[PDB]
Design an enzyme around this catalytic site. Sequence first.
Site, PDB file in Angstrom:
ATOM      1  N   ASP A 139       7.853  -9.251   4.217  1.00 20.77           N
ATOM      2  CA  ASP A 139       6.904  -8.194   3.893  1.00 20.77           C
ATOM      3  C   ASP A 139       6.668  -7.288   5.084  1.00 20.77           C
ATOM      4  O   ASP A 139       5.616  -6.655   5.164  1.00 20.77           O
ATOM      5  CB  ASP A 139       5.591  -8.793   3.400  1.00 20.77           C
ATOM      6  CG  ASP A 139       4.706  -7.793   2.683  1.00 20.77           C
ATOM      7  OD1 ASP A 139       5.219  -6.819   2.094  1.00 20.77           O
ATOM      8  OD2 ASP A 139       3.452  -8.041   2.693  1.00 20.77           O
ATOM      9  N   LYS A 142      10.824  -2.430   5.832  1.00 25.14           N
ATOM     10  CA  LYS A 142      11.772  -2.732   4.781  1.00 25.14           C
ATOM     11  C   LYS A 142      13.196  -2.685   5.272  1.00 25.14           C
ATOM     12  O   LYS A 142      14.063  -3.409   4.756  1.00 25.14           O
ATOM     13  CB  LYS A 142      11.520  -1.819   3.578  1.00 25.14           C
ATOM     14  CG  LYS A 142      10.041  -1.826   3.058  1.00 25.14           C
ATOM     15  CD  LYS A 142       9.429  -3.201   2.951  1.00 25.14           C
ATOM     16  CE  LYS A 142       7.935  -3.143   2.848  1.00 25.14           C
ATOM     17  NZ  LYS A 142       7.328  -4.466   3.156  1.00 25.14           N
ATOM     18  N   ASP A 167       8.890  -8.958  -0.829  1.00 25.92           N
ATOM     19  CA  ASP A 167       8.058  -7.954  -1.423  1.00 25.92           C
ATOM     20  C   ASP A 167       8.679  -6.595  -1.401  1.00 25.92           C
ATOM     21  O   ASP A 167       9.535  -6.293  -0.569  1.00 25.92           O
ATOM     22  CB  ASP A 167       6.693  -7.888  -0.698  1.00 25.92           C
ATOM     23  CG  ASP A 167       5.648  -7.124  -1.462  1.00 25.92           C
ATOM     24  OD1 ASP A 167       5.702  -7.075  -2.689  1.00 25.92           O
ATOM     25  OD2 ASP A 167       4.652  -6.565  -0.840  1.00 25.92           O
ATOM     26  N   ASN A 168       8.285  -5.727  -2.331  1.00 22.60           N
ATOM     27  CA  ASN A 168       8.569  -4.285  -2.231  1.00 22.60           C
ATOM     28  C   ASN A 168       9.997  -3.951  -2.406  1.00 22.60           C
ATOM     29  O   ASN A 168      10.513  -2.966  -1.857  1.00 22.60           O
ATOM     30  CB  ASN A 168       8.069  -3.684  -0.908  1.00 22.60           C
ATOM     31  CG  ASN A 168       6.621  -3.949  -0.682  1.00 22.60           C
ATOM     32  OD1 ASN A 168       6.254  -4.570   0.325  1.00 22.60           O
ATOM     33  ND2 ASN A 168       5.769  -3.430  -1.547  1.00 22.60           N
ATOM     34  N   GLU A 197       0.832  -2.956  -5.468  1.00 24.46           N
ATOM     35  CA  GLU A 197      -0.543  -3.356  -5.288  1.00 24.46           C
ATOM     36  C   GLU A 197      -1.480  -2.182  -5.607  1.00 24.46           C
ATOM     37  O   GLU A 197      -1.350  -1.043  -5.122  1.00 24.46           O
ATOM     38  CB  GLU A 197      -0.767  -3.865  -3.852  1.00 24.46           C
ATOM     39  CG  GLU A 197      -0.265  -2.960  -2.726  1.00 24.46           C
ATOM     40  CD  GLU A 197       1.087  -3.325  -2.203  1.00 24.46           C
ATOM     41  OE1 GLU A 197       1.980  -3.745  -2.948  1.00 24.46           O
ATOM     42  OE2 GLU A 197       1.299  -3.137  -0.973  1.00 24.46           O
TER      43      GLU A 197
END
EC number: 2.1.1.6
Length: 213
Positions: A139, A142, A167-168, A197
Site C-alpha cells: 500500500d 504504486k 491495494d489500489n 476508500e
Amino acid sequence: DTKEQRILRYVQQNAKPGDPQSVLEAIDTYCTQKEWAMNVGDAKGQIMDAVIREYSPSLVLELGAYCGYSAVRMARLLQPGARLLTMEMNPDYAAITQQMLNFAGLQDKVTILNGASQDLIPQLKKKYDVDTLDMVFLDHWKDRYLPDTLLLEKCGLLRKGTVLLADNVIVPGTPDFLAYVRGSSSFECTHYSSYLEYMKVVDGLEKAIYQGP
Ligand SMILES: O=C(CSCCNC(=O)c1cc(-c2ccc(F)cc2)cc(O)c1O)c1ccc(O)c(O)c1
Ligand SMILES: [Cl-]
Ligand SMILES: [Cl-]
Ligand SMILES: [Mg+2]
C-alpha cells in the site's frame, strides 16, 4: 496542523482507548464526513479482514502505513503472539501510525519501521530475525509494488503459500505489478473488485499467492 494530525486527534476524542473497532469507526466517520484520506477504508477493509481470517498469518509485512488504519485493521485480527511489521518512509506518517497503534492498544503486536522499503527489506533477516513472511500488504507508492516484490523474492523472504495482497490495483493503479503477477507461473492470483476508500469509484485488491521458483 496537517490532515493526519486532525485524523489522530479525532480518533483520540471519538474512540475508546484499547478498542480497535472504535478506532476504525472513528477514522471512517472522519473521512466520510470531514475530509477524505488515503486509508484503505471500510469497503476494501472488509475484504482484507476476510483474507486475514482465512490465512491467520503469524508474520505480516505491510509496505506503507499512512495513519495506521490498515495496521489496526490487520493487527486486531492476529492471533496471540502473531506480529506485524510496517515500513513507512514518511517520518510524520510513522509518528501518526505509532500513536494510532498506541491508542488502539496494539503496540505490542506491531513494529513500525521508519525508512524506505528497498533499504529495510534486505535487513529483515539479519537485523529483525525474520525467516520468511506469511503475508505482505502492499500500500506504498504504486510504482514500488513490482520492484519491492522482486526484492522480497531475491532476499529469500517469500515461501510457498506467502500471500501478497495489494491495494489500489485499479486507482491509482499498479499496471506493471498486475501484469507481472498475473503472467507469472510463480503466482496464483485473484482479483477482488471493490471501491476506492470513501468514494463511489471502482477500485480493487489483488491477492497473489507465491508458489516458489
Ligand atoms: O511513501 C510515501 C507515500 S506512500 C502513499 C501511497 N499510497 C497512495 O498514494 C494512495 C493514493 C490513493 C489515491 C490518491 C488520489 C486519488 F485521486 C485516488 C487515490 C489511494 C490509496 O489508497 C493510496 O494508498 C511518502 C514518502 C515520503 C513523503 O515525503 C511522502 O509525502 C510520502
Ligand atoms: Cl491504511
Ligand atoms: Cl469505504
Ligand atoms: Mg491504498
